[PDB]
Structure 1
């Protein structure tokens, strides 16, 4: 409670020594209260690079590019997907940089952010989303998104890497991760990516507001935000007193999302990001209490039995019977942070 009381987005600059152990560094940022914002930025040391160059990926195939059609007014929107046929990075880059789809002229970020919210229902862009793969070279052992080696490995497509090829005005809707897990996002190259976040301790406030604005979606599915179709502007959040923060990610930077941390955002122009999900001992309780989508068969569901028997042996008999009345404290850091406190 005393650490990061304002629950604002924190930025970290680790040394090569600190950076070498991923699991230990996540425990350190939690001891500083980074988790309270629900989103944190990590700038890696200058000497670290995951790949020598990105000049040999023109013929990489994007199997399912998606055209994003948006409908709405007065800060409330719904995004619909149209799956297009397979295209290459070369073909996607030519479309992204053409006069029809390129980034507009602007002086400061606040101007581009106004242009995004004013024009998001016009000229639908194409997002090169959910590409199975990695851009990390084999010999890279530090912060390798393809092999983080957290306790989530005990499960084994949530523990595999994904690529995102963006263009101006492509967006990601308000959501938490599958099973309310953590996530890591690295921006390989190109134009920035802007993020919005709601502290996990205020997450139920956002859900109540969203349920009020979309009553039909709430009856059909309790966890309707997991469909990733709902867009809400910062001005609408301010008008209904929902606490939030904003941050811009640049090429070469990492973004970390925390359990039950709601996030949304947009791409400034042509770029490429890589992501995966991970876990700590603290996630276990969030995973047991996660509210899942019930209207879709193909949804992500992990059995918690293995994590409870291995890390909570005393509580397994009670949990499996239905006697676990544990209340989550969102301000508490992970148990692995003890050495820093």
Structure 2
């Protein structure tokens, strides 16, 4: 009547055998989980990575959150220790409900969350130790360093240790040399009751995986990848200010929005309470949001499998159409892998090869098109050496790598080959095609991949 909880997302309890390789398991559940956007994974009962930290030596400054449905917030936006945050968090929840914190039913905190965010008269604010970069404060998982206990050593090399998962073989973001520290390094989240994360999808439509180390549950809502644009259409009509164009990736606009609103518009939505020791996995382009039930501690990281590669290319195209900034060049990543074809996993090699083929056929067509526009002069250019802000298309902000157009008239400016007419007002013959590779360089790179794929 007031809040109708979405149906539960899938929950998986893998045997030790299935659990042994996370990527195999994720590929296995994919047909199910991608229909719901998020899923929950319970590790085998004895898989218990030790969390050990001094609650007095980790400091952080949390984000302040107003709890206001449809109100805009920035995706990335007073000082606490873990102990002092915990004391604040427990007292807040305790005083809010006038009860002990583990007597407050999760269904009631959920009902109450959606009540207070929709009520203008309430101005509840909370704090969230969010997007704490694990570089400074350190992972909740064991990492190599002082001296580690034998049980910690058991978990050092686990695939499910979220420090490992980025840099494993079945992962694609591994051999990226470019700076993508926002997508390779785990983030830490210190939650309190009602602290929340707005509806979003991951950069470049990657997967994500979120582990709750300890504390009270984290409540999730998720939408499957296929419904991403449905969700966005619903959201555009109700909160169009979220969809205005805007510079940098440091300001993307996001919001809290009731799942029942989406369900009313026939957008499929699923839910779960993630408890301590459980993983949530989000699939490519799966919108998700949620809130914490109480004091807790989670750790999350992005990753990319071979399944994702074509979506990665589609995302960058979609970014271009939106005039949105890229975190990295997808083509640059593909070529880097091609250049390391001999040491690639063979299934990876085979999949990169397929994407590269499309890349090369698209590049060929784009180059013919700009030649017919009267761009004649050309010069090779090592795009990967340019800082990103020095190789974005003036028009669509895409990060150039395969090629770009420059002009003597507007020195330093580039456009991608889609936006040749947007570079300057000089005639075409004054333009130059800057290219990383000739077509003849490219076919051997692809063929290296083919030999490796056998």
Residue 86 (1) aligns with residue 79 (2): yes
Higher RCO (CA-CA < 8 Å; seq separation 6+): 1
Q: What is the rounded CA distance, in whole Å, between the counterparts of 1:295 and 1:168 in structure 2?
A: 37
- Quote the offset at 1:306 in angstroms: 4.0
In structure 2, what is the Cα distance between the partners aligned to 1:270 and 1:41?
20
Matches within 5 A, 1:54-133: 54=52, 56-62=54-60, 64-72=61-69, 76-79=70-73, 85-99=78-92, 104=97, 105=99, 108-120=105-117, 122-133=123-134
Gapped regions of structure 2 (runs ≥ 5): 1-6, 144-152, 339-351, 367-454
Aligned equivalents of 1:233 and 1:217: distance in 2? Answer: 16
Q: 2:175 aligns with which of 151, 154, 159?
A: 154
Q: How many residues align?
A: 307
Asked if 1 retains the 8 angstrom alpha-carbon contact of 2:72 and 2:242, the reply is no
Note if contact 1:221-1:295 (Cα within 8 Å) is conserved in structure 2.
no
The equivalent position to 1:145 in structure 2, one of 162, 176, 200, is 162
Match of 1:188 in 2: 213
Q: State how far apart, in whole Å, the 1-side matches of 2:76 and 2:359 are.
A: 44
RMSD: 2.9
Offset, 1:215: 2.8
Deviation for aligned residue 1:108: 4.3
Match of 2:380 in 1: none
**Does residue 47 of structure 1 match 2:90?**
no
| Cα distance change on mapping 1:23 and 1:82 into 2, 3 Å | closer
Instruction: Tell me: CA distance 1:287–1:252, structure 2 relative to 1, closer, same or farther (3 Å).
Output: same
Q: Give the drift of 1:274.
A: 0.5
Distance, in Å, in 1 between the alignment partners of 2:319 and 2:140 is 31
Inter-partner Cα distance in structure 1 for 2:357 and 2:281: 31
SS at match of 2:141: coil
SS of 2:40 mapped into structure 1: strand
Per the alignment, do residues 301 and 33 of structure 1 end up closer, same or farther by CA in structure 2, a change over 3 Å counting?
Answer: same
Aligned to 2:288: 263
Where do 1:235-274 residues align within 5 Å?
235-274=260-299
How much does 1:228 deviate? 5.0
Counterparts in 2 of 1:136 and 1:239: CA distance versus 1, 3 Å: same
Runs of 4+ in 1 over 6 A off after TM superposition: 80-83, 293-296
The alignment partner of 2:210 has SS state of strand
The equivalent of 1:334 in structure 2 is none
Q: What whole-Å deviation, never above 9, does each CA across 1:5-26 have from its counterpart, x for those lacking one?
A: xx97221111222212122111
Query: How far has the Cα of 1:102 moved from its partner?
Result: 5.5
Deviation of residue 199 (structure 1)? 1.4
1:241 is displaced (CA, Å) by 2.2
Q: Quote how far apart the aligned CAs of 1:204 are.
A: 0.8
Partner of 1:336: none
Do the aligned residues in 2 keep the contact of 1:155 with 1:302 (CA within 8 Å)? no
Within a 5 Å distance, the mapping from 1:256-295 to structure 2 comes to 256-290=281-315, 291-292=318-319
Give the Cα–Cα distance (whole angstroms) in 1 for the partners of residues 365 and 274 of structure 2.
Answer: 43
Question: Structure 1 residues 273 and 99 mapped into 2: Cα distance closer, same or farther (>3 Å)?
Answer: closer
Deviation of 1:320 after TM superposition, in Å, equals: 2.7
TM-score (norm 1): 0.81
Mapped to 1, the partners of 2:74 and 2:244 lie a distance apart of 20
Q: Which deviations, in whole Å up to 9, do the C-alpha atoms of 1:113-145 show, x marking residues without a partner? A: 111112235320010111122111133222111
CA–CA separation in structure 2 for the residues paired with 1:81 and 1:101: 29
Larger radius of gyration: 2
Unaligned runs of 5+ in 1: 1-6, 324-341
Question: Structure 1's 23 and 270: CA in aligned 2 closer, same or farther, altered over 3 A?
Answer: same
